[PDB]
Design a protein around this ligand. Structure first.
Ligand SMILES: O=C(O)CCNc1cc(N2CCc3ccccc3CC2)nc(-c2ccccn2)n1
Ligand SMILES: [Cl-]
Ligand SMILES: [Mn+2]
Ligand SMILES: [Zn+2]
Length: 475
């Protein structure tokens, strides 16, 4: 076993400084990948869905299940019969039970057009378009449940308008104690919290990622195309009683879809679009398409592009997990860097997270370990390079510290993550609102930060110690 990274002292010494370099500061910039090679012929563009057929509770705790779902060659896995094999009480998530539990709870309503089959037409039924319009409003569980039940009775006897109940927050364990406890029966690799889940080492709540979200659906309710925040895997269980239809594109094709968006004058990361399948076929993009029944679990693998529509009436619950794998960490870092270049907020603060991983996790896989320690090295050097430059300009550094569960801070202007050294205007320091800016956004306002002090959250000696103690663990 060979260490390939310099000591924190060595990194420190090189920041104090025509010497030799320790590493190449210039990193190649992120960019969308080209269409995958080798290309796929027309006859391979509708592949079948990787499927797991559970019968016994023992079946669900079979270790090879974990490796099958995280395998990069499987963009999505449907786990059939999951709820029945664990004897999960999905009734705890039925609309009737939810109304009884918290009838005032908020629901974010998306009002959409009911579209036909797998297509997306402009409002006049004239042409098939990618942009799928929606309006955001808000209501209560009781009011949305009314509409959902009403809508089913209307069904029992040129586009109609439907309402999708989205982003229902199930994080509060004192409002949802029985619901959340039921999900502790799941095997570790799909649980909301676990030691092998990267999002469980964030140290604070990431709403909808390390907490459960619920969706309430009528037929036609659509989830537009997207990748997960920072390419984290997603877990989704259909409560029933109706089915959902899923559309999945492998991660490696996200650059192709990015280009379709640009050309269609749509934003890939932030827009709402429903892909035209004839467009994807034309470009030799394979599309996985399947039905998720009540009690089926859907595993969206890292970076997989997906979209969904309800076929019947149903609720879904969903959250993220981050497998402790090189593939997962690598894709989360790449999207983190791409988000910076696009001025898109990273919902997962990958720098904060990586340092927490280095504190908590004994990593035995060499490839994953090397990626993490490399991230520590670059950020440790970036911090000390800024710290030195501050001293060199005589601008002092207020010890601000932080609490154990204090979230990561983002820049008020550009929304990049700000680690260790925060820039706050004096009128924001004085009123202790501590409006955080990144270094760049502050200077665009004060050449030498006239209106700015800088707070320090970590002791450099603490960072240097975590870096030095992060070593490759034995198998
Ligand atoms: O339909 C399902 O069961 C899947 C729900 N998944 C959703 C659902 C969802 N919302 C509901 C669907 C919807 C409908 C219309 C407009 C926008 C949106 C996005 C918000 N957002 C996201 C999201 C957002 C950012 C990053 C990662 N994920 N995921
Ligand atoms: Cl655990
Ligand atoms: Mn999602
Ligand atoms: Zn900024």
């Amino acid at each position: 076993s060979v260490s390939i990274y310099p000591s924190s002292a060595e990194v420190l010494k090189a920041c104090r400084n025509s010497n030799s370099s320790i590493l190449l500061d210039k990193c190649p910039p992120p960019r969308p990948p080209s269409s995958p090679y080798p290309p796929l012929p027309k006859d391979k563009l509708n592949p079948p869905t990787p499927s797991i057929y559970l019968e016994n509770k023992r079946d669900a705790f079979f270790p090879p299940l974990h490796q099958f779902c995280t395998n990069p060659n499987n963009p999505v896995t449907v786990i059939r019969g999951l709820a029945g094999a664990l004897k999960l009480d999905l009734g705890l998530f039925s609309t009737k039970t939810l109304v009884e539990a918290n009838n005032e709870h908020m629901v974010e309503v998306r009002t959409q057009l009911l579209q036909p089959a797998d297509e997306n037409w402009d409002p006049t039924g004239t042409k098939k378009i990618w942009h799928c319009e929606s309006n955001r409003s808000h209501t209560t569980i009781a009011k949305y449940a009314q509409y959902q039940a009403s809508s089913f009775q209307e069904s029992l006897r040129p586009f109609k308008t439907i309402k999708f109940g989205t982003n229902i927050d199930l994080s509060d364990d004192k409002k949802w104690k029985l619901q959340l406890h039921e999900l502790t029966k799941l095997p570790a690799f799909v649980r909301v919290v676990s030691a092998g889940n990267l999002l469980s080492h964030v140290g604070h709540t990431i709403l909808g990622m390390n907490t459960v979200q619920l969706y309430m659906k009528v037929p036609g309710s659509r989830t537009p195309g997207h990748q997960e925040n920072n390419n984290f895997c997603s877990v989704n269980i259909n409560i029933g009683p109706g089915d959902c239809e899923w559309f999945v594109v492998p991660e490696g094709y996200w650059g192709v879809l990015n280009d379709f968006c640009e050309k269609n004058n749509l934003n890939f990361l932030m827009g709402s679009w429903w892909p035209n399948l004839e467009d994807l076929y034309e470009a030799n993009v394979p599309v996985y398409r399947f039905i998720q029944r009540p009690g089926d679990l859907v595993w969206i693998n890292a970076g997989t592009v997906h979209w969904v529509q309800a076929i019947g009436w149903c609720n879904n619950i969903a959250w993220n997990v981050g497998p402790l794998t090189a593939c997962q960490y690598k894709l989360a870092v790449e999207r983190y860097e791409w988000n910076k270049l696009q001025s898109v907020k990273s919902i997962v603060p990958m720098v904060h997270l990586s340092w927490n991983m280095a504190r908590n996790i004994k990593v035995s896989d060499p490839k994953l370990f090397e990626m993490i320690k490399y991230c520590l090295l670059r950020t440790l050097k970036q911090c000390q390079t800024l710290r030195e430059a501050l001293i060199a300009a005589g601008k002092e550094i207020i010890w601000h510290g932080r609490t154990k569960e204090e979230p990561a801070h983002y820049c008020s202007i550009c929304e990049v993550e700000v680690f260790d050294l925060l820039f706050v205007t004096n009128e924001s320091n004085s009123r202790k609102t501590y409006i955080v800016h990144c270094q760049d956004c502050a200077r665009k306002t004060s050449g030498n930060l006239e209106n700015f002090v800088v707070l320090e959250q970590y002791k450099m000696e603490d960072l240097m110690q975590v870096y030095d103690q992060f070593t490759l663990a034995p198998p």
